[PDB]
Amino acid sequence: AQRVTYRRRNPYNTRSNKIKVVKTPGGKLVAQHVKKAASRVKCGDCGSALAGISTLRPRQYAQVSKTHKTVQRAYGGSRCANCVKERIVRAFLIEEQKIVKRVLKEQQDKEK
Amino acid sequence: GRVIRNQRKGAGSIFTSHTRLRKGAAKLRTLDYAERHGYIRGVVKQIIHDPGRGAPLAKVAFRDPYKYKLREETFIANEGVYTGQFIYAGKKASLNVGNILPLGACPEGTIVSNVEEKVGDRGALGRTSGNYVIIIGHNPDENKTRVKLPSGAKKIISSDARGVIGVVAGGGRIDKPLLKAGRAFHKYKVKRNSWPKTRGVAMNPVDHPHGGGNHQHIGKASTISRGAVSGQKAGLIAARRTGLLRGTQ
Amino acid sequence: GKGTPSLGKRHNKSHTLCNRCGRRSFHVQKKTCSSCGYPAAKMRSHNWALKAKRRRTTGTGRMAYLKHVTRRFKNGFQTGVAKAQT
Amino acid sequence: PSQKSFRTKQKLAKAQKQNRPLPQWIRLRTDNKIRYNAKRRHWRRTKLGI
RNA sequence: AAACUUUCAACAACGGAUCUCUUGGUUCUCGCAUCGAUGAAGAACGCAGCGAAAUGCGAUACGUAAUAUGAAUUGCAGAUAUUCGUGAAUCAUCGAAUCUUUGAACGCACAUUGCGCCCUCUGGUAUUCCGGAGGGCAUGCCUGUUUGAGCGUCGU
RNA sequence: GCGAGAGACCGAUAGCGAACAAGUACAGUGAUGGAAAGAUGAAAAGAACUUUGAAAAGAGAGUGAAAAAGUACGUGAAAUUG
RNA sequence: AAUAGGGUGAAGCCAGAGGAAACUCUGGUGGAGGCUCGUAGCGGUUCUGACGUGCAAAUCGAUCGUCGAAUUUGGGUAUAGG
RNA sequence: UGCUGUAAAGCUGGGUCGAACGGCCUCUAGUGCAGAUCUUGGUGGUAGUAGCAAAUAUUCAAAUGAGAACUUUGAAGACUGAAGUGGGGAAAGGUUCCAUGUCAACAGCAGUUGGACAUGGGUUAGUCGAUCCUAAGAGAUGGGGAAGCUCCGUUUCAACGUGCUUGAUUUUUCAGGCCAACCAUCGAAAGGGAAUCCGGUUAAAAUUCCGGAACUUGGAUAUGGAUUCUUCACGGCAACGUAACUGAAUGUGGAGACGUCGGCGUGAGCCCUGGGAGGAGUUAUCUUUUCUUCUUAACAGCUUAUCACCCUGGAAUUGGUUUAUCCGGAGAUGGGGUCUUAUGGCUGGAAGAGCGCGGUAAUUUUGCCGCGUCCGGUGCGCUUACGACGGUCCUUGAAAAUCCACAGGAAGGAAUAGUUUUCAUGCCAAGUCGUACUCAUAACCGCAGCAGGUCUCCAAGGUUAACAGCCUCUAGUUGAUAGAAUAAUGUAGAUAAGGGAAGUCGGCAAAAUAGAUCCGUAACUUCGGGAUAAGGAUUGGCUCUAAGGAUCGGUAACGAUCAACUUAGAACUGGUACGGACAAGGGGAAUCUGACUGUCUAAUUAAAACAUAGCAUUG
RNA sequence: UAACGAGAUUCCCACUGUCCCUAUCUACUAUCUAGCGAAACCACAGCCAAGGGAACGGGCUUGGCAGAAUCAGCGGGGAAAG
Ligand SMILES: O[C@H](c1cc(C(F)(F)F)nc2c(C(F)(F)F)cccc12)[C@@H]1CCCCN1
Numbered sequence A: 001a002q003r004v005t006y007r008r009r010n011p012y013n014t015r016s017n018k019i020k021v022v023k024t025p026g027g028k029l030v031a032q033h034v035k036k037a038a039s040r041v042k043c044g045d046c047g048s049a050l051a052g053i054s055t056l057r058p059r060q061y062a063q064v065s066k067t068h069k070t071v072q073r074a075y076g077g078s079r080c081a082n083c084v085k086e087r088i089v090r091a092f093l094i095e096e097q098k099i100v101k102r103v104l105k106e107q108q109d110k111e112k
Numbered sequence B: 001g002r003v004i005r006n007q008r009k010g011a012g013s014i015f016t017s018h019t020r021l022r023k024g025a026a027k028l029r030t031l032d033y034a035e036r037h038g039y040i041r042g043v044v045k046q047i048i049h050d051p052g053r054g055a056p057l058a059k060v061a062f063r064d065p066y067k068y069k070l071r072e073e074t075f076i077a078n079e080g081v082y083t084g085q086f087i088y089a090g091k092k093a094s095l096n097v098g099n100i101l102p103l104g105a106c107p108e109g110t111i112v113s114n115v116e117e118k119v120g121d122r123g124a125l126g127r128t129s130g131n132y133v134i135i136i137g138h139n140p141d142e143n144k145t146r147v148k149l150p151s152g153a154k155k156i157i158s159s160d161a162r163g164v165i166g167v168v169a170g171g172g173r174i175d176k177p178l179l180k181a182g183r184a185f186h187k188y189k190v191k192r193n194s195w196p197k198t199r200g201v202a203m204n205p206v207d208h209p210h211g212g213g214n215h216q217h218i219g220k221a222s223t224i225s226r227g228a229v230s231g232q233k234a235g236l237i238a239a240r241r242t243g244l245l246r247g248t249q
Numbered sequence C: 001g002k003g004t005p006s007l008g009k010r011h012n013k014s015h016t017l018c019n020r021c022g023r024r025s026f027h028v029q030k031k032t033c034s035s036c037g038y039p040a041a042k043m044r045s046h047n048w049a050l051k052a053k054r055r056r057t058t059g060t061g062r063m064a065y066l067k068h069v070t071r072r073f074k075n076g077f078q079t080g081v082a083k084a085q086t
Numbered sequence D: 001p002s003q004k005s006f007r008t009k010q011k012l013a014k015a016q017k018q019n020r021p022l023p024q025w026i027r028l029r030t031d032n033k034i035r036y037n038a039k040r041r042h043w044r045r046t047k048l049g050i
Numbered sequence E: 001a002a003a004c005u006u007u008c009a010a011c012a013a014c015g016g017a018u019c020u021c022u023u024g025g026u027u028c029u030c031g032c033a034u035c036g037a038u039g040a041a042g043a044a045c046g047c048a049g050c051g052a053a054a055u056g057c058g059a060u061a062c063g064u065a066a067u068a069u070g071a072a073u074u075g076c077a078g079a080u081a082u083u084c085g086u087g088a089a090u091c092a093u094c095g096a097a098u099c100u101u102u103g104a105a106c107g108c109a110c111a112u113u114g115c116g117c118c119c120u121c122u123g124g125u126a127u128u129c130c131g132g133a134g135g136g137c138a139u140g141c142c143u144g145u146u147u148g149a150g151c152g153u154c155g156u
Numbered sequence F: 001g002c003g004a005g006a007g008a009c010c011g012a013u014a015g016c017g018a019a020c021a022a023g024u025a026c027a028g029u030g031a032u033g034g035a036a037a038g039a040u041g042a043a044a045a046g047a048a049c050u051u052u053g054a055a056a057a058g059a060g061a062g063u064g065a066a067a068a069a070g071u072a073c074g075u076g077a078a079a080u081u082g
Numbered sequence G: 001a002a003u004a005g006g007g008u009g010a011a012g013c014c015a016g017a018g019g020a021a022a023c024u025c026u027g028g029u030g031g032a033g034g035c036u037c038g039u040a041g042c043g044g045u046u047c048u049g050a051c052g053u054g055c056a057a058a059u060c061g062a063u064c065g066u067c068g069a070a071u072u073u074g075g076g077u078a079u080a081g082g
Numbered sequence H: 001u002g003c004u005g006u007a008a009a010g011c012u013g014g015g016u017c018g019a020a021c022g023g024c025c026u027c028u029a030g031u032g033c034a035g036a037u038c039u040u041g042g043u044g045g046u047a048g049u050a051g052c053a054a055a056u057a058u059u060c061a062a063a064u065g066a067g068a069a070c071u072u073u074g075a076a077g078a079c080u081g082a083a084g085u086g087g088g089g090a091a092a093g094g095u096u097c098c099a100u101g102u103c104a105a106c107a108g109c110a111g112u113u114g115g116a117c118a119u120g121g122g123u124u125a126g127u128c129g130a131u132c133c134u135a136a137g138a139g140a141u142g143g144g145g146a147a148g149c150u151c152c153g154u155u156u157c158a159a160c161g162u163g164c165u166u167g168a169u170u171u172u173u174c175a176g177g178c179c180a181a182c183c184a185u186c187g188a189a190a191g192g193g194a195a196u197c198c199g200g201u202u203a204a205a206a207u208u209c210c211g212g213a214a215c216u217u218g219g220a221u222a223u224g225g226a227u228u229c230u231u232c233a234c235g236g237c238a239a240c241g242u243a244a245c246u247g248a249a250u251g252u253g254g255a256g257a258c259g260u261c262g263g264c265g266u267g268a269g270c271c272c273u274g275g276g277a278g279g280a281g282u283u284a285u286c287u288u289u290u291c292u293u294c295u296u297a298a299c300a301g302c303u304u305a306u307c308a309c310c311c312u313g314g315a316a317u318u319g320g321u322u323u324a325u326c327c328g329g330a331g332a333u334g335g336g337g338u339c340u341u342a343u344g345g346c347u348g349g350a351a352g353a354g355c356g357c358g359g360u361a362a363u364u365u366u367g368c369c370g371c372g373u374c375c376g377g378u379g380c381g382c383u384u385a386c387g388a389c390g391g392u393c394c395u396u397g398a399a400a401a402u403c404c405a406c407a408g409g410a411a412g413g414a415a416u417a418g419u420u421u422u423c424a425u426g427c428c429a430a431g432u433c434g435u436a437c438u439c440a441u442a443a444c445c446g447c448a449g450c451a452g453g454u455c456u457c458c459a460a461g462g463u464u465a466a467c468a469g470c471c472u473c474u475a476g477u478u479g480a481u482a483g484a485a486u487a488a489u490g491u492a493g494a495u496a497a498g499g500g501a502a503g504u505c506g507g508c509a510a511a512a513u514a515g516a517u518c519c520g521u522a523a524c525u526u527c528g529g530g531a532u533a534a535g536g537a538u539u540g541g542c543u544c545u546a547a548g549g550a551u552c553g554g555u556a557a558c559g560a561u562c563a564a565c566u567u568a569g570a571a572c573u574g575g576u577a578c579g580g581a582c583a584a585g586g587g588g589a590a591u592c593u594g595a596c597u598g599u600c601u602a603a604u605u606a607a608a609a610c611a612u613a614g615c616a617u618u619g
Numbered sequence I: 001u002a003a004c005g006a007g008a009u010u011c012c013c014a015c016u017g018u019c020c021c022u023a024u025c026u027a028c029u030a031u032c033u034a035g036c037g038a039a040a041c042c043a044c045a046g047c048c049a050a051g052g053g054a055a056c057g058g059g060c061u062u063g064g065c066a067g068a069a070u071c072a073g074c075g076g077g078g079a080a081a082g
């Protein structure tokens, strides 16, 4: 079987010096250098991987259209759907309870 | 003779602390207007392991009172503090585990931790896992508070000094034997170069005051004067007594 | 152990060429020349090494400017040009 | 090594040009005393120290 | 008796003593006061028709200008080189210049021929980008100029 | 340092380390250490040519006052050697 | 950055049997350990072998310790002569 | 050659030689050698002696040449045997690379050969690196020490921006709006990081040149599309989709960005194998046979997934489910969907390339023509990448440059027209330095062409648990002074009657055992061990038998087809052999000592010494 | 004190050239040849017995004796060399 060599001066099996073995149209077997695997965009609230967003190496996000990097919603590409749902409900209920505590307080600020 | 390992540690070449993996200095907030007059509320985001520390640390996010910003604080996690808990800090904060209160605002018998020796130094006493400070009494006329430290010593601190209510988490760590040299190696691998220790009696007279002899023996009293000089202070320094501790002290 | 086998592990230069004197006495980790003292303003020289002064001093190079000061002094440091005789 | 600095490669260029025999028309000059190039250097024998 | 060993002589070897020199050294005396931010001493790299070194020089590179002198240089070659002459050769003299990358070394940096910013000119359909040419940007301190700061302080 | 004149000085293992492409070649990671090495002849006139040899060389010849001066160069001692 | 192939078989989990209970027993599964046999590797026990004007100013051969961690190792970096 | 003197010495004959030198009266001194393990240089005996013996191994012929054990070519015989004697690199070297010539010196024999000697030639980058970032650390500035060379400090007792962003102005003036916690700088050719592949080509360069096909960054900028009269888009209940589809200050997040081990799954390359179309080998006999070609790059589009998520629904007779037992009223099973595109498929790239054949041109620069290049299968296979999981820690396993999204709502925007270069297409540019070769039993360091040392990538077939040992394919070497003999003594290796440690300080050295299956296994014990304890049996070849599965088709408990090596048993058989080479524990009863794993005297001591967990004391 | 140990020691089984008591075989040396070619060491050298002697002579005294040139081995001496 054919054996391969690195194509660059780095001779060490480092994280950025990974190779694949590929057969060429010349009936050869050469090493093809593999880039580092991309990591998934994650939610800032729960830490889970965000759906609908491309997995790219960070500079490659600059070279893609905006629809690949976001989701059409508030906090689209930043928070997941469930974490946005909790923000809306928490904001609504807490601000609603803020009114009751105000009207209740005004009842004790005029009689005692 | 030669410079002994005691004296070689002060230069601090290979004896500095290994601090690459440490998660920041654990401190209280800077004493500001909100803490001096009312209270401020923060939320616990993380409870993380700090290498070299037995106590977990808590990352608590506060708002900046003066600019639109978030301030991340590194507190020592008291036991029972959880992620998402609201932490209240100030004079008017309530007596709940994890809250930071002035010592005068705590009744007698209050168990408090990360107590300030001096007003605003952001925590000095009772910071290791399982340790705490007990409040003995108050002296409102002199504005002073009496506390009991983990060593059993009584100290008088300003009532404006702050502390965190509860016991430092991670206690009971010492109850388990290490069982291994490798375990001690890994323990000190992220603390400093102080292990392993060669017995001074096993060296040569250049290396130590205990070295030399046709048998391993100290030769003179191992209790050393407090007024001795560097290079002599090897052994039991200023020992008031020696031998097995029998009875109460 | 300490002789021939240990001498085979020598492939890391402690010193490289110096920019001031070009001599290969520039300590890489100290960033200092052991010969001329670069990057210090003064040149490294000692009275206990008189032979070292011989090796690098005035007259061991070109003296491309001190060559001619004596010849300029003898003429009173002339300014101008020579006049052709009639 | 293959990966070398400019300063290194510049010293190695000068070392090649000084490593040449004496041109023979020089031995015919009047009052000539040089019979051969006395500063030859072989790569395996004496190292450049660069 | 040969061979061999040893001694001696002649000639030839090995080797480089002796003799004789000597553009060198050493010491004494006499006279003089002249390095550098107007960039020194030193370093690196280059330069000749044919050169590796030494010597000289710096992209004007074994040298340019000028003054003097007066026919060479020379190992070979060769003038679009020269001879009763603005004229060969010449560190003879020397007063005008050039002086790469550096170096106290000065935009920052330098185990990198790494990275800036400003002005004028110029090319690419350009106040902004890319290329080129020239000129600039170190620190301490002094005198002065301008612009400022301080309820330090005077006046209304 | 620059420019000069000298000596009951040394005469190439001496005199400065260096009379010579000497602080050179070379050594050491480095600070540093650091040599050896002068002489054909007035003049290369540095041996054309023939011959044996694969060649280096040899034998004739030639130049030179001398080749008992051939660059392994004035003289050419001793050890050692044919 | 590197470390063949086996042995043993810890927690946890599944099923069955016995018992009034407290509980006990059996078969699997699982894959722990500064565990173990043993390569590369790291080391250097014995022959008091070879060599001992050596291949070598410390090597060569067999034998041997250890081989998943207090492991081995490149580069960078720090510590400098009482 | 002699003469004189007791002598130190003086004179002289002959030969050689070529430029200076002596006698006497005095002066002066660096003034007399056999020794100092004297200094520098030169030369001997030893002596044609010790020796040129590790790495299995060479032989015949031809060519060249004056000359051939050693050069070249052919034939053979061999070895390394993919953990290489193969193909590359990092450090280090520096021209050792290639062609031509060449043999005085070197290659401890030789030499026509060479990493030697001489003359020339040779290293092509927007995409590979450096350059940039920060790491441990190094280190300016403001200051503070120090007689000073200089020391401390890098968020520091500092009035610390060579600030940006706009509308501009062509009036080279401006008008303003925001900030300045932190932020000099150096520090990685193995960390982070913008972007390139295939085929061909040289005597020597190629991810660099040639052909084709792409990609990134920076700038400029028009057309098409898109959007707006409801000004800054629509669809889906939703997860979310798309060709686009304003968004300042400021803020919040994400990526960069992360240990190790265990088993499992998927892919890729390799291995194995069937048919067909070619080529080569064997053919006394046999062999539908043995060997070999049948390939597909970066890049673009469509499609493709475990996990995760959404809608429906409401669960005990608890169900789903992994090799590994985890999940579910905080919503399971079931039904239906969304996403990441890791990985595979189809197509474009692209057959025009490459490969294998056949037929022709010719000294011939260099070719021309034709055919084929297809369809499958298999797996506890090897290596590697990824994925979902699980174990582990008094150990929780970098940073920064850089890029993106979101929150916010500043500002500016249409109708006869307005905006945007995150949609498509188009235009220009990408500088500097390295780049040859060795990377080692001859290119590095050990004085050297030294049996030493020196980091790393790829890895075929058979046997086997095995990447061990042994044999072989691809590739590469055949290098190590040689010839003739075979004394003693050696070095390395074997065997040995009877006895079996009587040898010796001592079983030193050697022998014996050894794989696997099955049986059996003591004292003691910290209950984990001891333990492979001890001690036994079997093992080949051949011919069979049985068991263990997959996919389809509706008592389907059956048929059909396909498929991997594991286990158990039986008969026969042979000079009783059989882990047949290789590989591969000797065991037991006790005492001293250290608990154990671990560490040190590089180059005479590896231990009972050191360390260790544990215990205790002191500040 | 279970387990562990290239730690020190005694005994037992197996095993054997450790031994009785040696023998034989293989490769490489040694040996001889072509080529190549060192080093340690060296007052002068090299036959014994006795004597005396710095009390253990190669040399002196008295005796024994004594014949070229040599090759392989060898380890008594040179109070051998370092
Ligand atoms: O003064 C005592 C006290 C003790 C403790 C304890 F040690 F338990 F944490 N905490 C006290 C506290 C406390 F800080 F809230 F815990 C407050 C007041 C008194 C306390 C007594 C104990 C009984 C209940 C009333 N306080």
Ligand SMILES: [Zn+2]
Pocket: A043, A044, A045, A046, A047, A048, A079, A080, A081, A082, A083
């Ligand atoms: Zn979320």
Ligand SMILES: [Zn+2]
Pocket: C018, C019, C020, C021, C022, C023, C025, C026, C033, C034, C035, C036, C037, C038
């Ligand atoms: Zn220097």
